[PDB]
Design a protein around this motif. Structure first.
Motif, PDB file in Angstrom:
ATOM      1  N   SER A 197       0.854  -1.176   0.000  1.00  0.00           N
ATOM      2  CA  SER A 197       0.000   0.000   0.000  1.00  0.00           C
ATOM      3  C   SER A 197       0.891   1.227   0.000  1.00  0.00           C
ATOM      4  O   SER A 197       2.071   1.157   0.346  1.00  0.00           O
ATOM      5  N   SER A 198       0.301   2.358  -0.358  1.00  0.00           N
ATOM      6  CA  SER A 198       0.998   3.631  -0.345  1.00  0.00           C
ATOM      7  C   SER A 198       0.260   4.601   0.561  1.00  0.00           C
ATOM      8  O   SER A 198      -0.961   4.532   0.714  1.00  0.00           O
ATOM      9  N   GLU A 199       1.024   5.511   1.162  1.00  0.00           N
ATOM     10  CA  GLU A 199       0.504   6.424   2.171  1.00  0.00           C
ATOM     11  C   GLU A 199       1.075   7.818   1.923  1.00  0.00           C
ATOM     12  O   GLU A 199       1.992   8.276   2.604  1.00  0.00           O
ATOM     13  N   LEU A 200       0.525   8.499   0.927  1.00  0.00           N
ATOM     14  CA  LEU A 200       0.964   9.850   0.605  1.00  0.00           C
ATOM     15  C   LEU A 200       0.385  10.774   1.667  1.00  0.00           C
ATOM     16  O   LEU A 200      -0.797  11.119   1.629  1.00  0.00           O
ATOM     17  N   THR A 201       1.220  11.177   2.629  1.00  0.00           N
ATOM     18  CA  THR A 201       0.751  12.024   3.715  1.00  0.00           C
ATOM     19  C   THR A 201       1.100  13.480   3.454  1.00  0.00           C
ATOM     20  O   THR A 201       2.286  13.843   3.478  1.00  0.00           O
ATOM     21  N   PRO A 202       0.123  14.337   3.191  1.00  0.00           N
ATOM     22  CA  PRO A 202       0.413  15.762   3.038  1.00  0.00           C
ATOM     23  C   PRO A 202       0.765  16.398   4.369  1.00  0.00           C
ATOM     24  O   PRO A 202       0.258  16.008   5.423  1.00  0.00           O
ATOM     25  N   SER A 203       1.654  17.386   4.316  1.00  0.00           N
ATOM     26  CA  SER A 203       1.897  18.203   5.495  1.00  0.00           C
ATOM     27  C   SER A 203       0.698  19.121   5.660  1.00  0.00           C
ATOM     28  O   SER A 203       0.263  19.757   4.699  1.00  0.00           O
ATOM     29  N   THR A 204       0.168  19.211   6.877  1.00  0.00           N
ATOM     30  CA  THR A 204      -1.042  19.988   7.093  1.00  0.00           C
ATOM     31  C   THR A 204      -0.977  20.729   8.415  1.00  0.00           C
ATOM     32  O   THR A 204      -0.259  20.345   9.340  1.00  0.00           O
ATOM     33  N   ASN A 205      -1.752  21.804   8.481  1.00  0.00           N
ATOM     34  CA  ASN A 205      -1.976  22.554   9.703  1.00  0.00           C
ATOM     35  C   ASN A 205      -3.441  22.947   9.730  1.00  0.00           C
ATOM     36  O   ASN A 205      -4.022  23.251   8.685  1.00  0.00           O
TER      37      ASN A 205
END
Lengths: 439, 49, 49
Positions: free
Chosen positions: B35-43
């Motif tokens: 699986s892939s887990e593209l995690t965006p940086s967020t606030n």
């Protein structure tokens, strides 16, 4: 059979050769310098160490005179001082103000700790390489030690071996060398008795147990200028300690060719310098008559995936047919390649998957199997890892360092450039003979 | 010994390569991205409703 | 093991997302064992490894 060959003087490297007598079968020969113990001929110039400036209990003549005397002790020096009128805690130690003299005296002696923390100066007149050789011939093998001189053979039971002279005379020890607590330094120490103040060897003797120590530490007796008795001695900083602080790193970690260095006796171990001329008096019983050995009918070779490396980065499969099953020797007739295996079983038909290590990027080498010879070649690639924990078992024969794919361009371009050098003269000849045919 | 290869970024597809460890016999190598887990940086900016 | 001789004869095959192609190889080897199998060509991948 008194065979002879040149063996690379690299420790632990299994060098391999093949002997091809006329009536006997081929026999595998492999040599490894399992140890080298290059020991130089040496003698003790002098021992040296820290010195216990002893400034012995002074002498006085409360109303008269004194004079010093000669002595054998190291750097022994004296002065007679007048008007000293010295005191001890009891009070004045003499009954005359004038006419009273102090005989101050000073000399040096090896500190009690020189029994261990001391240095010895040695010359190295010459060094003879005594190499321990592992030798294997046929299926039998022996371990023995020999001197690389070419005069004294090293024999192990029936197997006698003569080695030397070394291809390149070498020694790691400079003409002067100093030993200290098992460490070795090539410091250019001064000759016996040539002591100079504060440099190395400012005090010297033949033995710590000797009674004829000599020294020159520029010890000076100053004029006693204090109320209590005293002997103000001013001298150079102990030369042995000064050198100890500035000796640099020991030869034991800086000797060329990776030689390890050991004392008792002083020697260089496992030096990998040059080559060793070897001749072996192989006992005839080691061979078998040619017909007794299995002999091939047909052989072919295939080499693949090879990588030029100090490792056996090459793999090759040889296909064979032979008169019978048995054990066969195998060898490489090109020194740019060497095999991992050395002997194998064989069958009427089948194949041997041999391993090999090679420097040339082309695996272009003649493999010999059980006395037959078959050409093998393939493109070997550069290793993925630039560093390996093992010494190379081969040296780059420049004749083969150029890959066929690269040597191609050399042998192509060197030809064409000359292509017309003669054509102009050919045209001259043609035109001249045409004139002579028509003139 | 180390090997390297590019791999198609597609989930579940088992990519396959062969490692040619020189004098060692080659070894199969299937690379499968479970699986892939593209995690965006967020606030968090603000909550609203 | 290693194979002395080998040849490829492709069976009927279909170019598709699935394993619609099938091939066969004759082989001659020095001994039994698990050899690796792979396609060096980028445009084809074998199901077995």
């Amino acid at each position: 059979f008194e065979h002879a060959t040149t063996v690379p003087n690299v420790p632990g490297i299994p060098y391999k050769a093949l002997v091809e007598r006329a009536g006997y079968a081929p026999l595998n020969l492999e040599i490894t310098v399992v140890s080298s113990e290059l020991t130089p001929s040496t003698n003790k110039e002098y021992v040296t160490c820290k010195f216990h400036t002893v400034i012995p209990s002074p002498q006085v003549k409360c109303c008269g005179s004194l004079e010093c005397k000669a002595s054998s002790k190291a750097d022994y020096t004296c002065r007679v001082f007048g008007g000293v009128y010295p005191f001890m805690w009891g009070g004045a130690q003499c009954f005359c103000d004038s006419e009273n003299t102090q005989l101050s005296e000073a000399y040096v002696e090896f500190a009690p700790d020189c029994t261990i923390d001391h240095a010895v100066a040695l010359k190295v007149h010459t060094a003879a390489l005594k190499v321990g050789l592992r030798i294997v011939y046929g299926n039998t093998t022996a371990h023995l030690d020999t001197f690389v001189n070419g005069v004294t053979p090293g024999s192990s039971r029936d197997l006698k071996v003569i080695a030397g002279p070394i291809s390149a005379a070498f020694s790691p020890f400079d003409h002067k060398v100093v030993i200290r607590k098992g460490l070795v330094y090539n410091y250019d120490f001064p000759e016996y008795g040539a002591m100079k103040p504060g440099a190395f060897g400012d005090i010297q003797a033949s033995s710590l147990d000797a009674t004829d120590i000599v020294a020159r530490t520029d010890i000076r007796l100053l004029k006693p200028s204090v109320k209590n008795i005293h002997v103000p001695y001013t001298q150079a900083v102990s030369g042995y300690e000064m050198w100890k602080n500035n000796s640099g790193r020991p030869l034991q970690e800086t000797a060329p060719f990776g030689c390890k260095i050991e004392v008792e006796p002083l020697r260089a171990s496992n030096c990998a310098y040059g080559h060793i001329p070897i001749s072996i008096d192989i006992p005839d019983a080691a061979f078998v008559r040619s017909s007794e050995s299995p002999t091939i009918l047909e052989v072919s070779c295939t080499v693949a995936d090879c990588i030029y490396s100090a490792d056996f980065g090459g793999s090759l499969t040889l296909q064979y047919k032979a008169d019978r099953e048995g054990h066969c020797p195998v060898h490489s007739h090109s020194t740019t390649a060497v095999l991992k295996e050395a002997t194998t079983h064989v069958t009427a038909t089948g194949s041997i998957t041999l391993h090999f290590s090679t420097s040339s990027p082309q695996a272009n080498f003649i493999v010999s199997l059980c006395g037959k010879k078959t050409t093998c070649n393939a493109e070997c690639k550069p290793p993925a890892d630039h560093i390996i924990g093992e010494p190379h078992k081969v040296d780059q024969e420049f004749q083969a360092a150029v890959s066929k794919t690269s040597w191609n361009w050399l042998l192509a371009l060197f030809g064409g450039a000359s292509s017309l050098i003669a054509v102009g003269l050919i045209v001259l000849v043609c035109s001249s003979m045409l004139i002579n045919t028509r003139r």
